[PDB]
Design a protein around this ligand. Sequence first.
Ligand code: BCL
Ligand code: BCL
Ligand code: BCL
Ligand SMILES: CC[C@H]1c2cc3[nH]c4c(c3C)C(=O)[C@H](C(=O)OC)c4c3nc(cc4[nH]c(cc(n2)[C@@H]1C)c(C(C)=O)c4C)[C@@H](C)[C@@H]3CCC(=O)OC/C=C(\C)CCC[C@@H](C)CCC[C@@H](C)CCCC(C)C
Ligand SMILES: CC[C@H]1c2cc3[nH]c4c(c3C)C(=O)[C@H](C(=O)OC)c4c3nc(cc4[nH]c(cc(n2)[C@@H]1C)c(C(C)=O)c4C)[C@@H](C)[C@@H]3CCC(=O)OC/C=C(\C)CCC[C@H](C)CCC[C@H](C)CCCC(C)C
Ligand SMILES: COC(C)(C)C(=O)C/C=C(\C)CC/C=C(\C)CC/C=C(\C)CCCC/C(C)=C/CC[C@H](C)CC/C=C(\C)CCC=C(C)C
Ligand SMILES: CCCCCCCCCCCC[N+](C)(C)[O-]
Ligand SMILES: CCCCCCCCCCCC[N+](C)(C)[O-]
Ligand SMILES: [Fe+3]
Lengths: 281, 240, 302
Amino acid sequence: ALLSFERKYRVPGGTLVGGNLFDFWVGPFYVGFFGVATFFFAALGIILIAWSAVLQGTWNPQLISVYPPALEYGLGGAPLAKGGLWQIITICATGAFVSWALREVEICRKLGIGYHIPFAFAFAILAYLTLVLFRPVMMGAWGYAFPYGIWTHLDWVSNTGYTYGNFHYNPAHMIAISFFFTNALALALHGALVLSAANPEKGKEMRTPDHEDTFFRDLVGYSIGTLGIHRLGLLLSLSAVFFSALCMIITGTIWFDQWVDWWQWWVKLPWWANIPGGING
Amino acid sequence: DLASLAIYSFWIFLAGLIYYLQTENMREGYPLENEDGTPAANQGPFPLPKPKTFILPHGRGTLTVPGPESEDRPIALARTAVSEGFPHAPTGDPMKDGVGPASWVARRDLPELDGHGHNKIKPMKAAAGFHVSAGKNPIGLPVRGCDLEIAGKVVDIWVDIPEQMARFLEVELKDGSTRLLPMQMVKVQSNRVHVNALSSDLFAGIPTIKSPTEVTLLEEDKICGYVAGGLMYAAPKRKS
Amino acid sequence: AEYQNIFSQVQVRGPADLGMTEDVNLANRSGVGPFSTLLGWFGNAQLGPIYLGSLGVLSLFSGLMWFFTIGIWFWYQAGWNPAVFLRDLFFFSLEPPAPEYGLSFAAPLKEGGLWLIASFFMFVAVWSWWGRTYLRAQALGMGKHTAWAFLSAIWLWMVLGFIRPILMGSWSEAVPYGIFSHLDWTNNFSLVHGNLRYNPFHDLSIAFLYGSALLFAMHGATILAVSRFGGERELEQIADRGTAAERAALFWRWTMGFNATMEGIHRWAIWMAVLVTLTGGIGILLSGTVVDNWYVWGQNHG
Ligand code: BCL
Ligand code: BCL
Ligand code: BCL
Ligand SMILES: CC[C@H]1c2cc3[nH]c4c(c3C)C(=O)[C@H](C(=O)OC)c4c3nc(cc4[nH]c(cc(n2)[C@@H]1C)c(C(C)=O)c4C)[C@@H](C)[C@@H]3CCC(=O)OC/C=C(\C)CCC[C@@H](C)CCC[C@@H](C)CCCC(C)C
Ligand SMILES: CC[C@H]1c2cc3[nH]c4c(c3C)C(=O)[C@H](C(=O)OC)c4c3nc(cc4[nH]c(cc(n2)[C@@H]1C)c(C(C)=O)c4C)[C@@H](C)[C@@H]3CCC(=O)OC/C=C(\C)CCC[C@H](C)CCC[C@H](C)CCCC(C)C
Ligand SMILES: COC(C)(C)C(=O)C/C=C(\C)CC/C=C(\C)CC/C=C(\C)CCCC/C(C)=C/CC[C@H](C)CC/C=C(\C)CCC=C(C)C
Ligand SMILES: CCCCCCCCCCCC[N+](C)(C)[O-]
Ligand SMILES: CCCCCCCCCCCC[N+](C)(C)[O-]
Ligand SMILES: [Fe+3]
C-alpha cells in the first residue's frame, strides 16, 4: 500500500548499482541492490548467531552470547566455536549496516533530498566499528571487542571501564556525556516548542515561529531559530557519538593507566604545583 | 513488591504511548491506498485517530486531520508492470509534470505570513532595513548551471523577514524575466553562483510566480520541486 | 561541491526583532542585545530582548546565591589563594551534613550548613524558573509543553537531592556540589546497589538517552535534507502539508516501513527526551528505599 500522496514519488531512478534490476518496493519498503545486500548479510548473521546459540547450549535470547577470539589469537582467525562466529557475524554486521546506509543514499536520490541522514547514520557505524575493529586492531587482538549478548555486552562495558578506574575521568568521555545530555535537553525543548505553538491554549489560534522566537527570547534572552535547532540537534548528536568513539580509541592505546591520574598533568604545573593549601597540598 | 509494580505498570504505559504516538502520526497520508488511489485492504493494526482541528491565524480558516485527502491534481505517471510494487514511469516530462523528485504539493496559493500578518518572505529590495551582514553578497554575480554555461545574473535576495534568513536568490535570464532559486540549492562562490541541479537550458522552465513582491506556498513548492528534480532529470546535461 | 546547509553562506540583518506582544507585559522586557555574526552562521544573530520580571529576578538571584555560596566555600578550601583555586578547581566539593545529623538543620555551617544553604537557594532558583517557563508560555497563548517536559528533568533532580535523602532519613545521601566529587558520588552510589545494569529503570533511561541521540540525528538530518523545500518551517507544514513533509515521511517509509508527520515527530521527540529522566528518577528513588541491590532483586524480582 501507499500513503495517499506517495504515488508521484514512486518513479524509476536513483539507484547506485544494478540500474532497474532492483528498483522496486515490497509493501512500504524500498529494495535497491543494497536492500538485497542488507537482507543477505543480516540473514547470514542472524543464521550464524542462531548457529552460535546451539553450540552454546541455549535458545534463551537473554542468555545467547557470542564471544570474540580470546586474546590469544591476536588479530588472526580462530575456530568458529571460539570466536570464529563472532568474526563472521561482525563482517555481516558491517555489511548489513554499510548496505543500509547506501540504500538510504538510494532512497535520497529517488526523492531528491540531501544525503544528511545516511551520513549521520555513518557516525553510529564508525562508533560500532571502533569497538569491534579500530580499537582491537590498534590493541593487537580481537579479544578487546565486546561480545554479542543482551547482558554480556553490559558486563563487558563495566569490565572495560573498571580496568581504568572510574571511567568518568576519561576526559573525552566527559565531553561525550555533555553532548548526550545536551542533546536530550534540546530534543525536549524542540519537541515542546513546536508542539506548544501548534497546540496553543484551548480555543486560541495556532501560534507561529515568531511566537517561538519570542518565547525563547523572553525566557533566556536568545532563540536559535528553526533552521538552527535542526542544525543544533544534528551537531549535538553526532558530536556525542564522535566523542564516544574518540574516548574509546584512545583507551587501552595511548592511555591505559587509571583515567583519574591523567588529571595530574594539570595539578603538577610549576606555578602552583608546590604552593601549599587546597585539596592537593 | 513496589519495584516490580513500577516496572509492570511502566511497560503498560509505554505500550499505550507507542499506540497514541503511532496513531497521532496517522493524521496525514491515511488511509493507505492501492496504486490506483482506492483504499487498501490491509490498513495495518493502528486505527485512524479521532479528528482534531487547527485554528489557523490570519482568517485563513481551519485544518481538520484526518480528513478526506485528495491530491488536488493530475499525476502524469503510468505503471511499468502488471503487479503491485514497482515504479511508475512518467508519461510526459517529469520536470514539467511535477512528478518524481520534481514533485510539488498543491499548497495554498497564498504566501506564508509572520505573526504580524505580513508576508514572511519578501525580496530584500523591498525589505526595509534588511541588508547582507556577512559572507559574499551574491547580488550581481553570474549564475552558472551544471552544463557550465551562464543562465543568468543574480538581481536580488528573497528573505525571511521574521527569521532573518536568505531563502531564495532572484535570478535574471537572457530575456529579462526573473526566477526564484532556493538558497539551499545554490553555491555562492567568489566570482559566480553555481547551480548543480539545473542545466543552463532548464532555468526558463522554473515555475514563475504571479507577483514580484511575494511568493505563495504553492509557488515555493513548484519552485523547489523543479530545482531538486533536476538532480535526477538533468543528469544527461550535467558534467564534471 | 553541493551546499549542505549546516552553515549559512550569506547572512542578512534587518531591524531588531522585538517580538510579539499579546498579554505579555512589555515593561518587563529589556531592549535588544547586540547581534552576533558568529552565532549568525549557525543560528540567529540577535541576542535579547529578555523578559526579566520579578519571578525571573528572584530566580536569577537565588541561582547566583547558590553558585556564589559554593564559590565562597571553594575559596575557603583554597585558603584564598588564586593559583590554588584554579589548580584544584575540580577537586573542591561542598559536601552535605554527615549521616549523624539526619534531616536536621543543626550540623555546623562548615560541615553541612553551607550545603543546606546552597541547596535552599538552588531549590527556589529551579522552582522559580519552572514557574517562569509556564508563565512565559501563558503570556503568549501557547501550550504548556515546555513546562511539562521541564518537570521531568526536575523529577530527577528533586529525587536526587531532596526526595531520596528525605525517604532515606538523611541529607548525607544527597549529591555534593563539585565536579569530581559528583562523579565520585555517582560511581559510589552505583557500587553500593549492586550492578547498575540490573536496575530496569536505569537501563530504560539509557535506552532513551541513546534513543534521544538517534532521534535528534534522524530528525535534524531529515529537516536539513528537506530544507530545499522549506522543511524547517514546521508549523506551516503542519497546517498545510507540502513536498518537504512528504519526501521526509517517505524517506522513512521506504527505509523502515513507517513514518511520522511534521506534528507527530515532535510528539515522538518530546517523549523520547522526557522518558530519560522520567524512568531515571524512578530508578534512583527506588534504590535503597525499596531495593537495596538490583542484582538480588533481578534474581527474585522482589
Ligand atoms: C561502569 C562503566 C563505566 C563506563 C564505561 C564505558 C565503556 C566501557 C564505554 C562507554 C561508552 C559510553 N559511555 Mg561510559 N561508563 C560509565 C559511566 C557513564 C555514564 C554515567 C551516567 O556514569 C554515562 C552517561 C556514560 C556515557 C557513555 C557514552 C558517551 C558512550 C556510549 C554511547 C555510544 O557510544 O553510542 C555509539 C553508538 C553505538 C555503539 C551503536 C551503533 C549501532 C549500529 C550502528 C547499528 C545497530 C543495528 C542493530 C543490529 C539493530 C537492528 C535490529 C532492529 C531492526 C533494531 N558513561 C561507567 C563509569 N562507557 C561506550 C563508548 O564510548 O563507545 C565508543 C564504551 O565503549
Ligand atoms: C554503546 C555503548 C555500549 C553499550 C552500552 C549499553 C548500555 C549501558 C545499555 C545498553 C542497552 C542496550 N543496547 Mg548496547 N551498548 C553498545 C553497543 C550496542 C549495539 C551495537 C551494535 O553497537 C547494539 C545493537 C546495542 C543494543 C542495545 C539494546 C539491546 C539495549 C537497548 C538499546 C537502545 O535503546 O538504543 C537506543 C536505540 C533505539 C530506541 C532504537 C531501537 C534499537 C533496538 C531496540 C535494538 C535491538 C537490538 C537487538 C537486541 C540486537 C539483536 C539483533 C538481531 C540479530 C536481529 N548495544 C556499546 C558496547 N547498551 C541498554 C539495555 O537495556 O540492555 C539490557 C543499556 O542500559
Ligand atoms: C559508575 C556509574 C554507573 C552509573 C550510575 C548512575 C547514577 C547514580 C545515575 C545514573 C543516571 C543515568 N545514567 Mg548511568 N551509570 C553507569 C553507566 C551508564 C552508561 C554506560 C554507557 O555505561 C550510560 C550510557 C549511562 C547513562 C545514564 C543516563 C541515561 C542517566 C542520566 C540521564 C540524565 O540526563 O541526567 C542528567 C540530567 C539531570 C541530572 C537533571 C537536571 C535537572 C535540573 C533541574 C537542572 C539544574 C540546573 C542548575 C540550576 C544549574 C544551572 C547551571 C547552568 C549554567 C545555568 N549510565 C555506571 C555503571 N547512572 C541517573 C539516573 O537516572 O539513573 C537511573 C543517575 O542518577
Ligand atoms: C549520532 C549517532 C546516533 C544514531 C543515528 C542514527 N542511527 C540510525 C540512523 C541514524 C541517522 C539511521 O538512518 C538508521 C535508521 O534507519 O533508524 C530507523 C539508524 C539505526 N540505528 C539503529 C540502532 C542503534 N543506533 C544507535 C545509536 C545512534 N544512532 C546514535 C546515538 C544505537 C545505540 C545503542 O545507541 C542503536 C542500538 C538501527 C535501528 C538503525 C539501522 C538498522 C539497520 O542497519 O538494519 C541493518 C541490519 C539489520 C536489520 C540487522 C543485522 C544484524 C545482524 C547482521 C547480526 C546482529 C549484529 C550484532 C552486532 C548484534 C549486537 C547485539 C547487542 C545486544 C549488543
Ligand atoms: C527531559 C530531560 C532533559 C532536560 C529537559 C529540560 N531542561 C530544562 C528544560 C527542559 C525541558 C527547561 O525548560 C529549562 C530551560 O529553561 O532551558 C532553556 C531547563 C534547564 N535545564 C538546565 C540545566 C540542565 N538540564 C539538564 C538535563 C536535562 N534537561 C535532561 C537531559 C542538565 C544535565 C546535567 O544533563 C543540566 C545541567 C538549565 C539551563 C535550565 C533550568 C534553568 C534554571 O532552573 O536555573 C535557575 C536560574 C539560575 C540558576 C541562574 C544561575 C546562574 C549560574 C548558576 C551561574 C553562571 C554559571 C556560568 C558558568 C557563569 C556564571 C556567571 C557569573 C560568574 C556572573
Ligand atoms: C571565581 O570565584 C567566585 C567567587 C567568583 C565564584 O563565583 C566561583 C564559583 C564556583 C567555582 C562555583 C562552582 C559551582 C559548582 C562546582 C557547582 C557543582 C554543581 C554540580 C556538579 C551539582 C550536581 C548535582 C546537584 C543536585 C542533585 C542538587 C540537588 C538540589 C536539591 C533538590 C535541593 C533540595 C533542597 C535542600 C536540601 C534544602 C532543604 C530546605 C528547604 C527549606 C527546602
Ligand atoms: C531596558 C533597556 C535595557 C536593556 C538593554 C540591554 C541589552 C540586554 C539584552 C540581553 C541579551 C543577552 N542574553 C540574554 C543572551 O544574555
Ligand atoms: C521504539 C519504537 C517502535 C516503533 C513501532 C511502531 C510500529 C510501526 C507501525 C507501522 C505499521 C502501520 N502502517 C504502515 C500500516 O501504517
Ligand atoms: Fe522539528
